[PDB]
């Protein structure tokens with residue numbers, strides 16, 4: 147199995163969600179960035195795995211679930227089976243990551259992408275080991291009811307470049323944003 151990664155888009159006040167959707171109106175190229183990052187696999191005959199909490203799964207429009215071209219794994223202790231359209235169900239992040247080492251998935255999975263929400267980001271974000279964060283900084287405050295956990299910059303180094311990530315300011319619908327990649331190894 148290849149690298150472990152989180153990806154998120156976050157406002158200045160560290161918001162990621164409001165009322166089961168995003169705090170901001172749709173940013174179509176930002177959404178395409180998420181698709182591109184999470185789907186593109188650096189390894190022949192493998193695809194990437196996405197790990198998400200149950201509310202994040204249900205926050206994706208049903209037409210667009212599962213996330214195509216990726217293996218979709220949902221985290222829940224209440225569900226008894228994967229939701230309609232999802233591929234796997236685990237009861238803890240440790241369990242999900244162990245599952246990628248089983249015979250079913252060992253040779254199928256390239257990158258693992260944690261796609262939220264707050265509790266799985268926080269646990270992944272303190273998982274000792276080599277981890278990257280792909281963070282879109284939405285450069286405005288937006289009312290939110292879900293937030294991204296604190297990024298400890300002593301351990302997460304902001305990388306000064308990364309191939310395939312644009313470095314300048316982006317703007318859609320009057321909203322400026324920029325792309326960042328962080329890396330820790332501990």
Ligand SMILES: NC(=O)C1=CN([C@@H]2O[C@H](COP(=O)(O)OP(=O)(O)OC[C@H]3O[C@@H](n4cnc5c(N)ncnc54)[C@H](OP(=O)(O)O)[C@@H]3O)[C@@H](O)[C@H]2O)C=CC1
Nearest residue numbers: 154155163166167199200201202221222223224262263264
């Ligand atoms: N801006 C962005 O990049 C993103 C925004 N979002 C937004 O965030 C919100 C959804 O996030 P959030 O509310 O944090 O909810 P989550 O997606 O984390 O869902 C929480 C549910 O997932 C299960 N769960 C979470 N972590 C684990 C775990 N480690 N092990 C087992 N089960 C787990 C639980 O289900 P159970 O009770 O069944 O056990 C829990 O009640 C929405 O507003 C969405 O739009 C989400 C992702 C990214």
Ligand SMILES: Nc1nc2sc3cccc(CNc4ccc(C(=O)N[C@@H](CCC(=O)O)C(=O)O)cc4)c3c2c(=O)[nH]1
Nearest residue numbers: 153154155177178180181202206210213214261262282
């Ligand atoms: N940087 C960032 N991280 C995350 S992490 C995360 C986890 C859950 C939800 C979101 C919400 N944003 C979405 C929601 C759905 C889609 C979707 O259906 N996408 C299709 C293709 C897009 C299209 O149809 O062109 C797909 O990937 O094929 C794309 C983006 C995000 C999200 C985010 O918006 N941005």
